[PDB]
Amino acid sequence: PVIEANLSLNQNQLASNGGYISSQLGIRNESCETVKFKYWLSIKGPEGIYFPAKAVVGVDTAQQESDALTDGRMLNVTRGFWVPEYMADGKYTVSLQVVAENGKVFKANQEFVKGVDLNSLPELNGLTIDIKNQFGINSVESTGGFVPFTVDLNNGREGEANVEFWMTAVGPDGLIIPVNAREKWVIASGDTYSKVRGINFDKSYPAGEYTINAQVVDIVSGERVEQSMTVVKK
Amino acid sequence: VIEANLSLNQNQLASNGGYISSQLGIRNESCETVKFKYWLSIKGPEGIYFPAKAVVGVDTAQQESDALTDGRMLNVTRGFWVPEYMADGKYTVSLQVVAENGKVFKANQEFVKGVDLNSLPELNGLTIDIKNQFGINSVESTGGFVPFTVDLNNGREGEANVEFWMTAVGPDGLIIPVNAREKWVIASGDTYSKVRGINFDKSYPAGEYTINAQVVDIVSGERVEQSMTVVKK
């Protein structure tokens, strides 16, 4: 019982004043028997924003209904959503999510930005943050694995920058795993805090999805900025 | 297998932040000797997640394993700073133990910063009251229904314009709609009051679901959150 899910956005790039985004959802039953499943469209944004794409004028009373697909058949839906002005500027993730009757989870994600450039590194006002999965390693075995991350904090400002920086891995069973302890830094003008920092996914760590999350706070302004990568333990 | 506790010397920090000293207890209740890894992590508002542990230099350490004799208990004092620049609001401290066999054990305490302990989140007179109606903290693998009471009380002298929604953030990257995005004009002294439940379908994966409600003031742009945790066995 395998489902194939895709998602595409008619646009990636919203200005600060927000806007409308029209999406195209594709759900294909690649299996031989007929398949029942639930699906929905959800948005995840900065500052712990999580919201459903779906909006209603009245009182939301609906429960999550099941759907179905004929053998080899595909569902095709257009779905649009507003992203209002009052929502935080930053990087957003739209997620088509399918839960099949058998427990298997399938997803398709697209990103968009609001009030910043699609290509751009997160920044604290000249101080740019560059965190990357160094070797494109997107999973580790049940028996364990090591994934290294490159960390580059570049002070583009004309003055010194005072920052606190840390990393966690948010994962199953409510786990928040320290990846990098809280570090305080004075970074001089034009200078760079640059290093490699890895996480060892111990054999004993539970199977599932780990969200590798890095944060940087400007100690003076109080602006906080994030970057995230996903690693799955099989 | 493992018994974990956590207590805080302080629950209540002012806006200018402060220091919190914690006491970690880890007890091996098992008959054989047990190996495990453990750590201390903080979760706050606005998607804040940070490790309790801080270093002045370059963090270079790896997550070391520990061990406990049969019936033996580990006892550690561990403190952490919560600086002024961190967001005001409700925080969760979490002692987390991962045993060599895969079993996860936790002990959580809450604290607040710049607001009263157990106070209702508010958007400036507009108070938000979301509660697990019947104290149901888990559902069986075969499924279950958990209802939530929702009370949005406009204490202001003028009308309040809000947008409101709910999700359940859970395993395998799932963000499950619990309440669609609703726009509301709430008159002075009035209440948006209702019950809203989530059906944890048999098919939903085992694990930890974070029931999350958010309210935005459309005029000010202030956003406020309330969260409750439900585990599917």
Residue numbers in the entry:
A (entry chain H): 38 to 271
B (entry chain G): 39 to 271
Quote the original article.
RbmA is a 26.4 KDa protein, with putative carbohydrate binding activity, which is found within the biofilm matrix, mediating cell-cell and cell-biofilm contacts. Even though RbmA is not essential for biofilm biogenesis, it confers a high degree of mechanical stability to V. cholerae sessile communities by a mechanism which is not well understood. We found RbmA to be a two-domain protein, functionally arranged as a dimer, with a high specificity for sialic acid, rhamnose, fucose, galactose and N-acetyl galactosamine. Each monomer is composed of two structurally similar (1.4 Å RMSD), but distinct (24% sequence identity) domains (A- and B-domains).
A thorough co-crystallization screening with various carbohydrates was unsuccessful. Furthermore, soaking experiments with a variety of monosaccharides resulted in the crystals immediately dissolving. As an alternative, a co-crystallization of RbmA with the 18-crown-6 ether was attempted. Crown ethers bind proteins, bridging axially bound lysines to polar amino-acids, with equatorial interactions with tryptophanes and other aromatic residues (Lee, C.-C. et al. in press), and have been shown to occlude ligand accessible channels. Since negatively charged glycans can bind to similar pockets, a crown ether was used as a probe in co-crystallization experiments. Within each chain, one 18-crown-6 ether molecule was deeply embedded in the wide groove, bound between K51 in the A-domain, and T218 in the B‑domain. Furthermore, all dimers containing crown-ethers had their tight grooves protected by the O-loop conformation, perhaps due to the interaction between the 18-crown-6 ethers and Y87. Crown ether dependent protein stability was studied via 60 ns molecular dynamics simulations. In the presence of the crown ether, flickering is reduced, with the protein closing around the ligand, further confirming the wide groove as a good candidate for ligand binding. Our results, however, additionally demonstrate that the wide groove is capable of accomodating large substrates. These stabilize RbmA in the closed, compact conformation, which is preferentially adopted in the crystal.
